Amino acid sequence: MGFKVKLEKRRNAINTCLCIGLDPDEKDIENFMKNEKENNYNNIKKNLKEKYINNVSIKKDILLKAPEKSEEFFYFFNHFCFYIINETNKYALTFKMNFAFYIPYGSVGIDVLKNVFDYLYELNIPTILDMKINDIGNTVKNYRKFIFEYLKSDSCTVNIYMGTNMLKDICYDEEKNKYYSAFVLVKTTNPDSAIFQKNLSLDNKQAYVIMAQEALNMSSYLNLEQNNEFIGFVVGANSYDEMNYIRTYFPNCYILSPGIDLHKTLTNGYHKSYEKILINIGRAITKNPYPQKAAQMYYDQINAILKQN
Amino acid sequence: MGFKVKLEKRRNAINTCLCIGLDPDEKDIENFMKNEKENNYNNIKKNLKEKYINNVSIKKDILLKAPEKSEEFFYFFNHFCFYIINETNKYALTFKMNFAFYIPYGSVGIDVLKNVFDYLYELNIPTILDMKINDIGNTVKNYRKFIFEYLKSDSCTVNIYMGTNMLKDICYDEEKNKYYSAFVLVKTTNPDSAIFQKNLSLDNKQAYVIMAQEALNMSSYLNLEQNNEFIGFVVGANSYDEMNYIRTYFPNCYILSPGGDLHKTLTNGYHKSYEKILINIGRAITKNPYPQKAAQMYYDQINAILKQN
């Protein structure tokens, strides 16, 4: 009942700040399908035995079939995500799905995305939708409906360069009086991020500092924190200077750190409530041949730095 | 054969720079469905009877039925868009679809969007997908695939606040040796737009000015101009001062102007090749009870102001 309590409770249960990124590309699905057919559907038959696969709402008929060839891509795309979640959810404080990977095939990927979020909700695992949404206020409400109503995601990523007021139409819904969490793009992984995030300035502060300041001001205006919701910051893992600054001048804020030296990133943005520094690791786990092992490795590496801090 | 070439021929054929925005909300579909049920599906039966409806690729069986109640919403959503396109397409230089309106219901809206783009492609009408995409380079290729390959869109809107290099991954595909057009967000409609677009600055130029030149530097770098493609700007119609600066200091640009006083907007950003100043009208046409007249009305006004130039 609120993203902060759900994050707090889950953090107490598993004591890590690892966020697992599920961003399946075309190679992953064909390799998964090729591997599954070669090795007698070991993972698929384990998927079909897990409890919540019965609760997904899109094409459950097709998914629960043993291994209709128009649905072949849908079948393995959906089972690949279930396999990654089933293998690795034990080490994940949260799961972050990037919408770009589910859209390039049309509706079929949104159906998988919908199943993935339904599966994660059934598992009561906190979710983040990485869609970097941005638009004018009334148009933006369609994104809020899709993200927080259709997918029932716990939070999402936002590009507020078009204004901070859009956060009012993402993080709050007057018609149901429900509050939602968001992560705004502050400092990002690309090498040319600095052209606008850094070189732009106002009142001698850099643009990402102004954007972060603008975000938190809207968080207090909307009363998010009071309703167990928040507005957080996306800070690239490689951005050590900026990450240190954000934690220094903004403690109490939630940071989501994609693009991954792990020790430097965690120590710079550490917090006592370390669900306030989510470490996103994606391809390193999903493309690793033993995802549960790879996730367990990164789980231990992050627990080492947490106690050694 | 090229977005710049396609706009050129279509502009001379119909002599207008009107861009019609197809952004159907939930009420638009209910009102259309209520009207169709009362008047024995007058417009729906007019839609089915047009030649090009046969070239849509999703749920074609369902669409060509006359008026299984689960597909009811899909049926009227798709036919409403077909109705709007059929009524107003002869006055439109291009059609701009905003992705936000097609996603809030899950996969079902993407199926409609795909049919709308398939329908418009067959009509050889230029398209713009208003998705305001932004992401890191390799993830963004998924958007380029969705926009320019799946929907076969002619152009799209881009938020380059995360870096200009992402335009390299949108407007060009080395793997397929294809070039695409895009519109970059420069100055936008909202009242809180000024916090980052205006107040942020570098060496005393405002953020939209440096964003705009950074966008065009990537356009010249990518050789878009040679390949009959371009990178344009999204400048709000209400932003008269900024529109004035953009047209003079970057002439020969493509400008897409959503969102006042139409006369002031057009003459401020007018160009001899006036397909370089697309005028977006959405709610005024699609929510008007007589769309063809409203499209013809706005068509005549903008054709009239063109003569005073």
Domain ranges of chain B: 1-309
Report whether A178 contacts A212 (CB < 8 A): no
- Give the position of tokens 């749920």: B59
Strands (E) in chain A, as ranges, are 18-22, 94-98, 127-133, 155-158, 172-173, 178-179, 181-187, 201-202, 205-206, 231-235, 255-257, 277-281
Q: Residue positions of B in the annotated binding site for UMP?
A: 23, 96, 98, 130, 132, 135, 139, 189, 282-283
**Which residues from A are below 8 Å from B202, CB to CB?**
199-201
Structural determination approach: X-ray
Question: Beta strands A178-179 and A172-173: pairing type?
Answer: antiparallel
Tell me whether residues A106 and B139 touch, CB distance under 8 A: no
| Smallest Cα distance from B250 to chain A, Å | 20
Q: Residue positions of A in the annotated binding site for UMP?
A: 23, 96, 98, 130, 132, 135, 139, 189, 282-283
**Which residues from A are below 8 Å from B103, CB to CB?**
110, 142-143, 146
Q: A177, exposed or middle or buried, with CB in 10 Å at 0-12, 13-18, 19+? A: exposed
Nearest CA in chain A to B196: A161
Nearest CA in chain B to A137: B190
Q: Measured between alpha carbons, how far is A64 from B176 in angstroms, rounded to an integer?
A: 37
- Homologous superfamily, domain B1-309: Aldolase class I (3.20.20.70)
Nearest CA in chain B to A165: B192
| Smallest Cα distance from A76 to chain B, Å | 18
Q: Between the CA of residue A213 and those of A4, A162, A184, A197, what are the distances in Å?
A: 20, 15, 11, 13
Tell me whether residues A190 and B165 touch, CB distance under 8 A: yes
Helices B72-88 and B26-38 cross at an angle (nearest 10°) of 90
Q: Measured between alpha carbons, how far is A84 from A123 in angstroms, rounded to an integer?
A: 13
Tell me whether residues B137 and A100 touch, CB distance under 8 A: no
**Which residues from B are below 8 Å from A207, CB to CB?**
196, 200, 207
DSSP secondary structure of A117-133: HHHHHHTT--EEEEEEE
Give the resolution value in Å. Answer: 2.7
Q: Which two tokens stand for residue A172?
A: 């709050």
| Smallest Cα distance from A24 to chain B, Å | 11
Report whether B290 contacts B27 (CB < 8 A): no
Q: Measured between alpha carbons, how far is A57 from B134 in angstroms, rounded to an integer?
A: 30
Smallest Cβ–Cβ distance between A192 and the set B98, B140, B165 belongs to B165
Tell me whether residues A111 and B111 touch, CB distance under 8 A: no
Amino acid in position B93: L
Specify the DSSP class assigned to residue B87: H
Specify the DSSP class assigned to residue A252: S
Q: Between the CA of residue A249 and those of A184, A214, A226, B178, what are the distances in Å?
A: 17, 14, 21, 46
Nearest CA in chain B to A103: B146
∠ CA(A179), CA(A151), CA(B98), 5° rounding? 90
- Please report the number of interchain residue pairs, chain A to chain B, with beta-carbon separation below 8 angstroms: 168
Q: Which two tokens stand for residue B199?
A: 């107040």
**Which residues from B are below 8 Å from A117, CB to CB?**
none
